[PDB]
Amino acid sequence: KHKILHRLLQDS
Amino acid sequence: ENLYFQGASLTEIEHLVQSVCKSYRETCQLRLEDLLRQRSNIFSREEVTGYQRKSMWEMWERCAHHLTEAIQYVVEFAKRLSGFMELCQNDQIVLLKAGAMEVVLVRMCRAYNADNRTVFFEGKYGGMELFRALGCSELISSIFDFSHSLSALHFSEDEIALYTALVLINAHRPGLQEKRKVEQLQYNLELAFHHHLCKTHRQSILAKLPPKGKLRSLCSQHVERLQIFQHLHPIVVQAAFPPLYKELFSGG
Ligand SMILES: CCS(=O)(=O)c1ccc([C@@H](NC(C)=O)C(=O)Nc2cc(-c3cc(C#N)cc(F)c3OC)cs2)cc1
């Protein structure tokens, strides 16, 4: 249940 | 939301060429000149034997980590790509899940030396024998062959930038919510790529590019070989595989 993609997409 | 979500003029297509090439230059991970220069730094027979003696799980873990690092640069490229951040988060994730690996496979041809059939891995150039401990020689040789066919095209960095943008912006990916928006973005990126090939007298490469089915088969084989490894070493995947790698290739 990992969710790194949304973190990467959200980080600015 | 974005100019490239509607019909683009020639001047706007010219601007897209420049933009895609810049987004790629800023996220290419390794510079081509560094990769070219290191071609003479080849693993010794002793070093090759060292990799061959490594356990299957330790080789799988090292490759997953290196692939995860390459994928992180692709996520950044996507983020800098015109129109991508204007798509909805579902579409952004669909496109990256289906496409990140494909972009990595295309990018890898820069790290491949067609003269001796070696690839840049962990500081030096090694042949497919370097990966014998993995126990998926059919997938390794198929990736080597793919890198070999792309290397025959003598791709420029600008060509890789434009082609990978198209690999990623694919309106045929299953699960896209704003399909027409992606279709328009893809069309403008196709025009950008084809304009650049027209402008540099490189339209002869169009019939030589691999079929879309080829990148899909390579990605499917990877997912399949990962499931076979996962059955043999489930705690290795769960404990030591990068979380991003698992999110993309083993459903989390
Ligand atoms: C992809 C972007 S770039 O061209 O800038 C770039 C970045 C890093 C590396 C490199 N960095 C390290 C530290 O090692 C790297 O990660 N090299 C890998 C090769 C393979 C690999 C290559 C083939 C083929 N051809 C076939 C395979 F089966 C393979 O995986 C078993 C996996 S990881 C290479 C290229």
Ligand code: NA
């Ligand atoms: Na090459």
